Write an enzyme that holds these catalytic residues in place. Structure first.
Site, short mmCIF file in Angstrom:
data_model
loop_
_atom_site.label_atom_id
_atom_site.label_comp_id
_atom_site.label_asym_id
_atom_site.label_seq_id
_atom_site.Cartn_x
_atom_site.Cartn_y
_atom_site.Cartn_z
N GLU B 113 0.82 -1.23 0.00
CA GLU B 113 0.00 0.00 0.00
C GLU B 113 0.85 1.27 0.00
OE1 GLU B 113 -2.22 1.71 3.34
OE2 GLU B 113 -4.10 1.76 2.19
N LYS B 190 -9.93 2.69 -1.69
CA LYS B 190 -10.03 2.14 -0.34
C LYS B 190 -11.39 2.40 0.31
CE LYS B 190 -7.06 1.63 3.71
NZ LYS B 190 -6.11 2.19 4.71
N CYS B 227 -5.61 -2.34 2.63
CA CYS B 227 -5.18 -2.10 4.02
C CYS B 227 -6.22 -2.35 5.13
CB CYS B 227 -4.54 -0.71 4.15
SG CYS B 227 -3.79 -0.27 5.75
#
Lengths: 381, 379, 380, 379
Positions: B113, B190, B227
């Site tokens: 990431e 995300k 993440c």
């Protein structure tokens, strides 16, 4: 093997052991709990494991510590599967009765059984007779009535799982967890949401999908929930109990064998982290053998033996830590004391529930369930 | 490295059993890697490990064998240097890592990431860290990576800070999928944004509005779960419902509390949704110009870390690759048959028993204002 | 430490008449004479009390709808290193007496600043023990307590607290709660826009509000609350307007050097633009915390947070406005207004008649979409 | 000039604080203007004032410094004179003002609203006032102005009455952007049409159907928000969402109720959308041939005014330039770094938190026939 934890401490230098335990379990070395001397004695004499552990929370200003003790009981069936079903149920009853007493002397407040604890896990045969006669009423059934007395007497919530015959709704069979209050009075029931049909676990032959929703029971020792067996695998199941406000979610189960064992230390654990509450996965022990031969849906020849059920019950904490497992092969009572406050504390620090975006997922799931569903796949132009 | 430590301390017959419980199998299914690829790794000082997952032979379908390369690394020049110099050093390091993955015969290569920058979100400074944000399609990193993709004939997925020009020059945390033709496939933002501790990402970007896209490449249906989204099982679930077969998890996490969850979360997702999972994590510890505090009681400091690497792959049947190193740059090459997905779905039947209509309803109710939880009290 | 008093202290009366005309809405302030006993409470307890009046034209078919609002700005009271219950209780007791003075000044609607019940602890980014300040919306101690003063004084009380939602995963929110003059809980509204700028790390504590844009129909007017950072989003103020608001309170908490010049601007425009009343309220004093924190600038870690610059005022739909309260002293602002001025302005200026909301509804939908291509005209 | 009044009556250290609250800074960031420019302004009897806005130094982007000239003036010969002579007088006055702006090194120059004519809309007479309306592209004013644009190498934005030939000879209120190449870039029609009081503009033209265009010139992305549209924050916001960096606001307002709004509305827009704002206003008072009534109770009159000038520039960070005179012709020259836009967008994050999808939906609901407002009553 017998207990992975014991294996790891019998082969590793203490400082590397410290690190391996840090990554596998939640902590650097076990937070043991010292158990009443009289309780350990009951366990030693009757030949079953008793292990004690402690989870803790940080001290809060506006809320007193909510310390609670749970007793998870794993056992095997007791007399041969070819014996009057009443005698079978009664042998298990009398074994567990003594285990519930040790849990009581160890000062437990909530005690819980494995799945269909009352009977040999007979669903592998796919025979209806005499196995269906194990099915009793949830409220007035012998096992509940009996267990309700030990609840009143020891002042503790007892959760147990049995085959249920529903009288009013066409004498149908269900897989049911029943919560008995510490008052002695029947709190309610919850029916298994997700029904397995994989391999020897032909449970779809005996009952349909549970229609009790995802109830949480508010007892005087926490908001409790039961996620039954195969529902272990459905993280959206665990999640819904969470959304209904659970703090400890018990997982009574019954699983053999080679492919299912590595999943054991994964599934229940994740649910605890993800929904930020406590998790108590309980599993049957020993191997059981049945009157007539059966086949397991593999290529294999027919056999009579079913197993081995690998026990290994443990407790998972909302912060990511977890209790060592019990034995793989030996009856056991797991006593763990925890502070219920760790739930909110973790929820506030990691903020998993603050970031769930449940409205988004409720919409996306509705779309996916519809007939005209076209997946969101992007192709090269 | 845990696998190496367990093999260095246990009798072979007991290690067979501990590996059975911890990983998916009784001894690792190693993959032999081309001699020239291990060479590049050796020379440039990064780990290269190869593993294999396999499926049952099918009557009506050819084996769909595919090779993935997960790349974990650290930053490279000190955080106090022109941000373009910083991005370029990591560029050149990873350039040669993508080359070794190419010679090991990978088909899909993937980054950690924000792989292009020091994970500078802990400082909560906007300057000059926001200048690391580039365009998703025309940004320098995508343009440059797009050429390695055409040249090596491999799908490249990477994670960067994105500046969206058209939508008010806003920053986002985006994974970009570059096709093996060289052309930009698309992006995904995300979904779940962390605000815990040092991970002050809520400060830099909002929640992703790209939904849950799955990319149909000729090496499988791929998805990226970025993440913190690691922690949301309903997140993994939705990529599943959209038909994913390999879901990469590029990440960046330090620490004492976060590390035990590493072997847990991504693994379950693979079991639960019956597909492949590729969790990748940054490595090393990074130190920043000015002091910052971490939301704990403690004093301000400049160092951030250590990021614990430990990248691995999880399989739909419950098995898993050993991890890479906790502190060393690494290239993980694993070959898998994509048919193992449907095969497991058919045998365990997780998807046939999901009861999504019921959960779609239950979650709608729960999100409503008047929500009254299903709590049963003593009468 | 007060701009109105400063301009009256330095300018010839004829020029001051003109400077007041352009800065505020009128040529000389329309003061309100306040009950003798109310000024007393204020004097004794050491807090400002200032009264002003807005008026409307008289209507044929509608009686004058005269209403009195009391905006209360204060500081925290006991050091941040003390039982969180003690801290909330001290602020309770101070404000209790301030709501009494507002009552005797004959207020009908009283309103607090943002998170009025706690030191603005969000700068530290610590969850302990600051999250224990969060209470329930309907049954929380502060609402219960305030609900009594509402019944007793027959006044609507609006206040802003940290909210823990029990049913929805014990999550925290930033909530304004409207308590009716009957004593009964009317409802709540959650902060729509959440700041992450500088020391204001509120994004760490709570998500974006899902309450929409509610307007509360009380017997003292249609009221709405626009919380703090939501100050900056004109489409926010706009939507309360579209929902029929007449007084929109703006409870806030802001320091400092870059933020201050915006104060006189933002809340004022919204009143003009939507043709309703605006009550911006801001915390006062500077507060200091147990351990050191950094503010996302280059600077070294510190313990002090502030100074919050108070300066509460009321803005009118016709463009006029009340002077502000003090920059660093506790204060109660009592202003009386005729709610009819709203429709009257709407009919003369015709802002709502010319909004073309259909078009903006459409344009905003397009802009939010993924494939958005801005309407940019290039040279051919 | 309020600024001059505040510095003529206040001790310097208090003045420093009053300036801090009213304007954006503690003392004016003056700009030194070319000697030759001030001369043209001196001799022709119009104000010339110079100020400077600055940004922070960026690593990946060179400073984008640009200079704007806002021009406020009055009509110059009596309203009772051949309309062509009227337009010509204003032409020749402004022509020399555009020249001073050129020597002051301006890159973009902009006029007030309907700069070409006395603001004759108060009379509600069609004759001879409609003959002031010309073509946008081929109209005399555009053609003439286009020359000065080519010659001084500067973008010229101006506001005129437009007759659209193709669409039924209809009249519109239009801003026209002429590029520094000399070539006609495009036009934009006034979105919001006033009918308040003397400003009977709805009698002469309908609502603009050009949308919310932003012009990409080589001196920034520019937009024009015309007059009354100053009051609609949703208008300002849309130009922002289309990526504008400087939004001019050509206007024409008199009066007692309208003046206190002047330092508020255009200012807010600049902070809210995080870009630059240039509100320009007509000056002087104008007198018309025949008597008219203003929609108040009052008796009919011939005089209209006074237009209160007071042009200024608003910065994205909350700061602003002092105003020009209330009664005197003026050229405002201000130099700014366009990078301050993104910089403040990054720091305050207004665009990151706008939640446009939500308001797009809420506004749609509100516009519908069955609209039931979200009002909570006591139960």
């Amino acid at each position: 093997l017998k207990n992975l934890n014991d294996c790891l401490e019998k082969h590793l230098p203490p400082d590397e052991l410290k690190e391996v335990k840090r990554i596998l379990y939640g902590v650097e070395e076990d937070q043991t709990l010292e158990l009443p001397t009289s309780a350990k004695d009951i366990a030693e004499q009757n030949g079953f494991d008793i292990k004690g552990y402690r989870f803790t929370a940080r001290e809060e200003q506006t809320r007193k510590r909510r310390i609670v003790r749970v007793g998870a009981i794993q056992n095997s069936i007791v007399i041969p599967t070819t014996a009057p079903i009443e005698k079978q149920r009664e042998a298990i009853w009398n074994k567990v009765k003594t285990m519930i007493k040790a849990a009581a002397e160890a000062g437990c407040n909530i005690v819980c059984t494995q799945e269909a604890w009352t009977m040999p896990f007979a669903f592998c045969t796919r025979e209806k007779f005499p196995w269906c006669e194990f099915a009793e009423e949830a409220e007035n059934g012998p096992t509940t009535k009996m267990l309700a007395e030990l609840a009143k007497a020891y002042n503790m919530v007892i959760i147990h799982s049995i085959l249920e015959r529903d009288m009013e709704h066409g004498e149908t069979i269900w897989n049911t967890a029943v919560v008995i209050s510490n008052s002695g009075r029947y709190l309610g029931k919850h029916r298994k949401n997700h029904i397995p049909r994989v391999g020897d676990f032909n449970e779809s032959t005996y009952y349909m999908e549970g229609n009790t929703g995802h109830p949480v029971f508010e007892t005087e020792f926490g908001k409790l929930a039961v996620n039954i067996c195969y529902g272990r695998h459905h993280p959206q199941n665990w999640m819904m109990f969470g959304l209904n406000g659970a703090e400890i979610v018990f997982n009574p189960s019954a699983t053999i064998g080679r492919l299912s064992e590595p999943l054991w230390s994964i599934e229940a654990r994740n649910a605890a982290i993800a929904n930020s509450y406590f998790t108590v996965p309980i599993n049957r022990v020993g191997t059981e053998q049945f009157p007539n031969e059966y086949t397991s849906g593999d290529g294999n020849k027919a056999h009579k033996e079913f197993g081995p059920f690998y026990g290994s019950s443990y407790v998972a904490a909302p912060d990511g830590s977890r209790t060592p497992s019990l034995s793989r092969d030996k009856d056991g009572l797991l006593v763990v004391e925890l502070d219920l406050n760790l739930c909110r504390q973790v929820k506030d620090f990691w903020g998993f529930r603050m970031t769930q975006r449940v409205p988004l997922y409720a919409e996306s799931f509705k779309k996916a369930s519809e007939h005209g569903f076209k997946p969101q796949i992007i192709k090269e132009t």
